[PDB]
Amino acid sequence: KSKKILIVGAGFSGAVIGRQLAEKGHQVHIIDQRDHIGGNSYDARDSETNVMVHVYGPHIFHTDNETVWNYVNKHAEMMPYVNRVKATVNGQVFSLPINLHTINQFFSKTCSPDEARALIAEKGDSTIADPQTFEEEALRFIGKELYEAFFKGYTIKQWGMQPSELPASILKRLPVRFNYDDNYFNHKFQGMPKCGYTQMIKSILNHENIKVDLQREFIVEERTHYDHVFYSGPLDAFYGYQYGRLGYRTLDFKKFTYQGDYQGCAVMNYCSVDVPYTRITEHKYFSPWEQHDGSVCYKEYSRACEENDIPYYPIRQMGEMALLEKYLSLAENETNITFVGRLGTYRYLDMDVTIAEALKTAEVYLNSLTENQPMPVFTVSVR
Numbered sequence: 208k209s210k211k212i213l214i215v216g217a218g219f220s221g222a223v224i225g226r227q228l229a230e231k232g233h234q235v236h237i238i239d240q241r242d243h244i245g246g247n248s249y250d251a252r253d254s255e256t257n258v259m260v261h262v263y264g265p266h267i268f269h270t271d272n273e274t275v276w277n278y279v280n281k282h283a284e285m286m287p288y289v290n291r292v293k294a295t296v297n298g299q300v301f302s303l304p305i306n307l308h309t310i311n312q313f314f315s316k317t318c319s320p321d322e323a324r325a326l327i328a329e330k331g332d333s334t335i336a337d338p339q340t341f342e343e344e345a346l347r348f349i350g351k352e353l354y355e356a357f358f359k360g361y362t363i364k365q366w367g368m369q370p371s372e373l374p375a376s377i378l379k380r381l382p383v384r385f386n387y388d389d390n391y392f393n394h395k396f397q398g399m400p401k402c403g404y405t406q407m408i409k410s411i412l413n414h415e416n417i418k419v420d421l422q423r424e425f426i427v428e429e430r431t432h433y434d435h436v437f438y439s440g441p442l443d444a445f446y447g448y449q450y451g452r453l454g455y456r457t458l459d460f461k462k463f464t465y466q467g468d469y470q471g472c473a474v475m476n477y478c479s480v481d482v483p484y485t486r487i488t489e490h491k492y493f494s495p496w497e498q499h500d501g502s503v504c505y506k507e508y509s510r511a512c513e514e515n516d517i518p519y520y521p522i523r524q525m526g527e528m529a530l531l532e533k534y535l536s537l538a539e540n541e542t543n544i545t546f547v548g549r550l551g552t553y554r555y556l557d558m559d560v561t562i563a564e565a566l567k568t569a570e571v572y573l574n575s576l577t578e579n580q581p582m583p584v585f586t587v588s589v590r
């Protein structure tokens with residue numbers, strides 16, 4: 208039986224479920240409230256500069272999942288790109304994550320790796336028996352100068368919270384690498400789509416069995432015209448925020464164009480509270496195989512997600528999870544729908560993890576047909 212599917216969202220979740228289902232002969236209808244596909248992974252070429260701009264902030268592709276890597280290479284030319292981050296703080300510029308250079312530079316030293324391990328040990332705060340706080344976990348690990356330089360002000364700006372208000376759980380391991388490797392990400396596969404994520408997702412959507420409708424908001428009544436709905440929209444929004452809004456940080460991006468080269472790297476973090484933006488991204492650096500005279504940059508600002516804002520980073524502490532549980536027990540009562548994705552499940556997910564879950568979701572749904580069985584509302588655990 209060729210099933211009639213509605214998908215709410217044209218991001219990775221929607222596109223990847225859609226395409227898997229379309230290929231098995233189902234009639235997939237994808238809608239998006241935005242005037243463009245891609246969801247938050249969307250990029251577009253600035254008309255004045257011709258720079259590929261990542262519209263909703265830097266998107267760097269990285270995965271240890273070979274299946275997912277193979278999948279993206281089917282839909283794009285993946286360019287070798289290894290993300291490297293600088294941070295400005297204390298009137299100095301450092302490598303991130305904290306590594307041997309960061310240390311040697313920070314302390315005006317020349318430590319070998321083993322010498323640096325001793326320094327971090329004799330810099331770690333030897334007091335709080337059982338650290339209960341992110342502040343004290345950090346202090347135990349790296350000590351005061353580094354906690355303050357690299358962690359304190361960044362948390363306050365990014366989360367609108369004191370690190371003393373967060374649990375020790377946030378920092379499981381010593382955040383230092385005892386060599387000169389300055390790759391930000393440890394993933395096996397790391398690349399950048401030559402022609403961008405939007406072209407990649409356009410290719411993913413490129414199937415006879417998929418109809419895309421843009422500038423179209425979901426309306427609950429439509430539900431009855433379909434065999435099943437896959438919903439990648441905000442879970443609380445689906446229920447009209449009847450219990451209250453789920454906690455999110457929003458981001459404002461202030462766009463500006465520079466002639467030449469504004470910062471000389473893709474991403475520069477500003478760890479200080481004395482800098483109101485959190486980082487500056489210079490988009491042309493995500494495409495090193497291109498040359499651009501002009502440069503589009505974003506100053507990035509973190510903020511509480513008020514009602515009109517794009518939700519970005521989920522807060523997810525005790526009271527948020529408490530409020531989620533209310534939606535979850537409404538949702539787990541629903542009959543012909545599956546909530547997926549960063550918003551439908553209130554988790555932060557990377558692109559590769561999105562595609563992974565999206566492939567599995569479709570696999571689960573397809574199986575449920577052959578084996579004539581009910582399709583679950585969640586294919587991944589949410590609590």
Ligand SMILES: Cc1cc2nc3c(=O)[nH]c(=O)nc-3n(C[C@H](O)[C@H](O)[C@H](O)COP(=O)(O)OP(=O)(O)OC[C@H]3O[C@@H](n4cnc5c(N)ncnc54)[C@H](O)[C@@H]3O)c2cc1C
Binds near residue numbers: 221
């Ligand atoms: C600031 C930031 C930076 C990121 N950078 C990286 C990175 O560098 N590397 C990485 O791996 N991942 C990155 N990500 C994660 C990446 O953005 C997500 O994995 C990806 O967006 C997941 O897409 P999705 O399809 O699951 O959901 P989304 O991309 O949010 O797509 C959902 C779509 O649904 C639409 N929609 C919602 N509600 C409705 C409705 N009611 N009706 C119609 N349409 C609706 C929205 O318009 C949207 O287009 C980043 C995330 C953030 C917040």
